Structure formats: C-alpha cells, structure tokens
Design a protein around this ligand. Structure first.
Ligand SMILES: CCn1nc(C)cc1C(=O)Nc1nc2cc(C(N)=O)cc(OC)c2n1CCC[C@H]1COc2cc(C(N)=O)cc3nc(NC(=O)c4cc(C)nn4CC)n1c23
Ligand SMILES: [Ca+2]
Ligand SMILES: [Ca+2]
Lengths: 181, 181
C-alpha cells in the first residue's frame, strides 16, 4: 500500500503532461521582453520543489526571502510564477518555480489520524514519490527535458540551509550543461 | 504497485474532505427555493459516478439523455451541478451529480504506452479505487453520510443499461432509508 505511486502518476497524467508542452513556448516569448528590458533570461525548464518534509507554504518567499516573485508567466488556463533568486540582494537567477502539490496530500494524511499514516510513513512516501516521478519523466517524451526535480531534506534544525542556494545550484548546473554539450 | 491507493486518498484528502462539509448547507439553502418554485427537492448527498470503464464524458447528458442539467449549486470556489433524472419525459428525481475525475487518469494511463498499463489493469485499478474510497469514507466523520458512491459496469455491449435508472434506484433507496429509520 503505497500512495506515492498513484500520487505521482496522477501528478504527471493530469497536470505535467498537459502543462509542460506549452511551457517552452511561453518562456521563449517572455524572454524576448525580459531580455530587452532587464538583460535577463528565464530558464526554459519548470523547476519543481520536492521538500521531503512535505511542507508547502502558500507563498515561496516565506520559505526563503531570497526567492522573490518576479512576474506571472503569460499563456500561449494555467497560472505560473517566475521568481528571481537573490544573492546579497543581487539577482542571481530567474526561473518558473513551484511546489509539487501532491506532497500537501501526504502532509494532510499524516495529520489525519484515521489514516494511520505516520511521519515516518510520510517521509518514506515522499521519497518514493520523488523516485516514481523521476522514473516516469525518464520514459516521457520531451517532458523530462522541460522540467527539473529539486528534492531536498531540510536539516533537523539550526543549520545553514538556503532554498534559494539549492535552486541556484541547479540553475548553474543547467547552464553548464547547456554550454558544454 | 497500485495507483488506485494514491488516487483514492488524493481524491479524498484534496477534494472530498474539503467540499462535502459545505454541501449539506448549500443544498438545504437551494431546496428552499426549489421547493417553493417547483415543489421539488434535491437529495442532500453528493452522488459520485464511478463507471468501471473509466469513461468520463464532458457533459452528463451525452452518457444518458434522461439526465438533464437543472441548475448550478450556489456557494455558501467549487462548481457543482444539479441534475434532474427523467422517466418518460417526466421529472423523477434531482441530485448533485458528478463523475470521479481520478478515473480519467486511469483511462489516460491505459492510452499511454510507456505506462505498460492495460485495459485489464485499468479495470482492476478502477475496482480497487472504488473499494479504497469506500473504506476511506467508512472511517470518515459525517463525510460518508454526505455522499454516495455509484459504481457500475456497463454491458459487454448492446444491452439495457440506463445510467439515469441506476441513479434513480439509489435515490429511491436513500429516501426509503430516511423515512423508515
Ligand atoms: C487533489 C484532489 N484530486 N486528486 C485526484 C487524484 C483528483 C483530484 C481532483 O479532482 N482535484 C480537483 N477537483 C476540483 C473540483 C473543482 C470544482 N468542482 O469546482 C475545482 C477544483 O480546482 C481547485 C478541483 N480540483 C483541483 C485540481 C488541480 C490540478 C488542475 O489545475 C491546476 C492548475 C495549476 C496552475 N499553476 O495553474 C496547478 C495545479 N496543480 C494541480 N494538482 C494536480 O494536478 C494533481 C495532483 C494529483 C495527486 N493529481 N493531480 C491531477 C488532478 N492542479 C493544478
Ligand atoms: Ca520546510
Ligand atoms: Ca461508459
């Protein structure tokens, strides 16, 4: 009995498979403007946050102030937000960013006692969700190329973890890949 | 590996658990009007269609013409549709009616070859979805009393199946239950 299998399949079949095709077009279009205006550029892949603690806030900035809402992405109806990632108040990157909503479900199950679903269970299913979704996107056509999964475990407490730094690590790796190959 | 577990849990935690509480109230309010106008009454329970063939149309009437849209249910934002069930052109019942969307996912998985998910698999998982959702609602607090699951397998082919008759059987059984106990 693994809820993560179905959660992952539903998240792909009912959301990602449908939104990802439009995305590279929406982003190229926006980048025309963003470039001519702020000489910037938004990455072309959807960045999906997978906090293994299943903590999904209502606004990204609350999880890190160095992640700042920049703009809504226009459509070619799905709502997507571009964020700028800051370092010392200086813009270091930009990307379309959002949390994997199914993890909220996991969280809620852990707070729903009739479910008999512990925090241990919840973490286990979060990792399985990440794995299953990786596997799905691996066999998927151009969907894998259109997004990147950012899975992370935050420290038990009082340790220097920056979500913005994790995302920037991924963005910089993506650019390195793009220019070297 | 059973996607129905997660599909069922997500459909409960993320949709039903949230909408059902408002529903008894929304329906009572509407019934004030409906009564004073057409001397009719809408059942208080959400009726959830679970076709085991995972065929979900975009409008109920296409699956049966004796199921006729009547009105949108107002809010106390979620969109819910009241339907009248007809017999020989005469109204025989009314209720808030909608398909279980997760079945669409199953259908799509069966048409997505990378999934290795057959029609046999689709039917098995549809039955498991029905069972798991029944189990969940059974342990759930007054949520089970707010909705009713209408699961059905349509004929091999060319036999007498009427969706409106199935729904009316359930509605008539529900009224019998309310008046006798
Ligand atoms: C969670 C409940 N659930 N579990 C399963 C299984 C099926 C359902 C289900 O039926 N949900 C649902 N019923 C609604 C009814 C009404 C109404 N009658 O008024 C109104 C709704 O909108 C609130 C309803 N919603 C929300 C569906 C959101 C669904 C599409 O839109 C989205 C838009 C954007 C966006 N940036 O623009 C992001 C984004 N992220 C997700 N998440 C999933 O896609 C996902 C997760 C899992 C697991 N599977 N999926 C596929 C269903 N989405 C969306
Ligand atoms: Ca956290
Ligand atoms: Ca059918």
């Amino acid at each position: 009995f693994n809820v993560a299998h179905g959660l992952a399949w539903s998240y792909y079949i009912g959301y990602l498979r449908l939104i990802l095709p439009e995305l590279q077009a929406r982003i190229r279009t926006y980048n025309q403007h963003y470039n001519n205006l702020l000489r910037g550029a938004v990455s072309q892949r959807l960045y999906i946050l997978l906090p293994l603690d299943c903590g999904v806030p209502d606004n990204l900035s609350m999880a890190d102030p160095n992640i700042r809402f920049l703009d809504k992405l226009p459509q070619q109806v799905y709502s997507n937000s571009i964020y700028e990632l800051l370092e010392n108040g200086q813009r270091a990157g930009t990307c379309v960013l959002e949390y994997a909503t199914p993890l909220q479900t996991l969280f809620a199950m852990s707070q729903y006692s009739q479910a008999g679903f512990s925090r241990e269970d919840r973490l286990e299913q979060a990792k399985l969700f990440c794995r299953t979704l990786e596997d799905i996107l691996a066999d998927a056509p151009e969907s894998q190329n259109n997004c990147r999964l950012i899975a992370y475990q935050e420290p038990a407490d009082d340790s220097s973890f920056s979500l913005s730094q994790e995302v920037l690590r991924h963005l910089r790796q993506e650019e390195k890949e793009e220019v070297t190959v």
